[PDB]
Design a protein around this ligand. Structure first.
Ligand code: HEM
Length: 439
């Protein structure tokens, strides 16, 4: 079905994969002025998939994508019904459903004043400042940047790992419609699961929404010291392979909670010990489907993060409907001595989470509500799965199966991932930005 890679905002389909990234949130002050600026800004800065997959030699110093909130489209006079059920009322209005603690959200997210967001991906912060200025210059006061969240890859060997220390970005759906390599174990879905209007999208979209996509953005603050402290105070005693020490048991616990070792080695393949080499191998680190641990939790818990967000075999076989693309990035400094040596967070660090799907309710929202937060999911298992330890928000946050030996044992885990704000955005096709929004 050959997708128009030159017209699709790159981050939706390929992911910026740049070291630094900045999210510039803004509200529209003067619509007319804004659309006019848009007409000159897009062709000059909005980077497409085609540009991201082309050789470095011709890529910008920084990538820029742009998304709008419902109130943003409203402010710009674009009143078409995009067809998604959550997008219209905003995420904060949906936060309770996600199981969020509203007291934790902070402005300017605690409402719908945010009209859209500019995603700037570059390798150096100074380039980030350069393009940031270019934005508030091309647009001047026709808009007002209300907040900017910036993130960067963690140092050295940690690059690519989120702040709890786990390698992130391993498993991603592969969509048909473009020449691309498929890793063994990688889901292959119709372009409609991610791009609105395309094949597989069950929603009813206006024609201009073609090749667009909804972004679920979550500003997460992570309590790292607390996380470690907790795994030590709960280190798993042993497993098939033998008795585990303190560290060993703690490391094993963390891995049991995620479904992967901090190295990326999926526990359904390295069930009793880490396999660094396997983790670093994209041709092997994702070739599993729990088909060998369906009715028992020896190889992998029923409620491990990755298994809850992508149950794979736990639901019969392949299913397109619930896959989504992720393009998140860590933020904040590393954990100090005074921090870990106290088990109490003393600095702001976390994840700037970005998830793309044609239907919010079938991706992020589904993974969150229907799976992660559902104690009875995966369905019909010998032992109750429980609440996903990492992002599940149903209380009591009780998850079972962590200890492979005495599986029935349950653990009520403290929430280490804290929602500070979020929003639902729509990223139109590059052409739509000018033919419809700026029109
Ligand atoms: C502080 C926040 C979070 C951290 C540390 C974290 C992320 C992790 C890690 C470290 C992996 C392993 C890599 C892989 O299989 O790429 C992964 C997987 C995944 N996570 Fe998260 N995550 C967070 C939040 C969320 C939220 C809020 C959702 C959805 C409601 C989610 C969804 C997914 C998906 C869909 C996958 C891949 C499953 C698969 O295909 O095997 N994550 N995540």
């Amino acid at each position: 079905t050959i997708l128009p890679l030159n017209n699709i905002q790159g981050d939706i389909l390929v992911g910026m994969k740049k070291q630094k990234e900045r999210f510039v949130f803004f509200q529209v002050n003067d619509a007319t002025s804004f659309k006019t600026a848009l007409k000159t800004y897009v062709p000059e800065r909005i980077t497409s998939a085609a540009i991201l997959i082309s050789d470095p030699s011709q890529q910008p110093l920084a990538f820029v994508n742009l998304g709008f909130s419902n109130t943003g489209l409203q402010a710009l006079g674009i009143t078409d019904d995009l067809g998604d059920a959550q997008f219209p009322d905003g995420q904060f209005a949906d936060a309770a459903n996600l199981g969020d603690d509203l007291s934790q959200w902070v402005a300017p997210f605690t409402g719908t004043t945010i009209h859209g967001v500019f995603l700037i991906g570059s390798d150096q912060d100074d380039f980030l400042d350069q393009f940031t200025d270019d934005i508030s210059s091309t647009f001047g006061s026709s808009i007002t940047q209300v907040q900017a969240l910036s993130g960067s890859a963690r140092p050295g060997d940690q690059a690519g790992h989120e702040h709890f220390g786990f390698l992130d970005g391993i498993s991603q759906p592969s969509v048909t419609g473009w020449e691309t390599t498929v890793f063994p174990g990688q889901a292959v879905v119709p372009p409609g699961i991610i791009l609105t209007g395309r094949d597989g999208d069950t929603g009813t979209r206006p024609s201009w929404a073609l090749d667009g996509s909804f972004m679920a953005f979550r500003h997460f603050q992570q309590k790292v010291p607390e996380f470690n402290a907790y795994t030590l105070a709960n280190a798993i005693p042993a497993n098939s392979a033998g008795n585990l020490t303190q560290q060993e048991g703690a490391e094993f616990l963390g891995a049991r909670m995620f479904g992967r070792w901090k190295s990326g080695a999926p526990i359904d393949l390295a069930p009793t010990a880490d396999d660094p080499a396997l983790g670093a191998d994209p041709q092997r680190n994702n070739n599993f489907d729990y088909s060998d641990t369906l009715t028992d939790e020896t190889r992998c818990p029923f409620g491990a993060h990755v298994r809850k967000t992508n149950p794979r075999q736990d639901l019969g076989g392949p299913v397109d409907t619930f896959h989504a693309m992720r393009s998140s990035i860590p933020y904040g400094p590393e954990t100090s001595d005074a921090e870990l040596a106290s088990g109490v967070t003393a600095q702001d660090r976390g994840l700037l989470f970005v998830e793309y799907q044609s239907i919010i309710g079938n991706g992020f929202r589904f993974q969150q509500i229907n799976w992660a937060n559902n104690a009875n999911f995966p369905f019909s298992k010998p032992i109750t799965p429980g609440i996903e330890p990492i992002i599940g928000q149903t209380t009591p946050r009780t998850v079972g199966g962590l200890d492979p030996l005495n599986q029935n044992e349950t653990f009520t885990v403290p929430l280490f991932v804290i929602p500070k704000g979020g929003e639902y955005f729509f990223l139109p096709s590059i052409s739509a930005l000018t033919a419809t929004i700026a029109a």
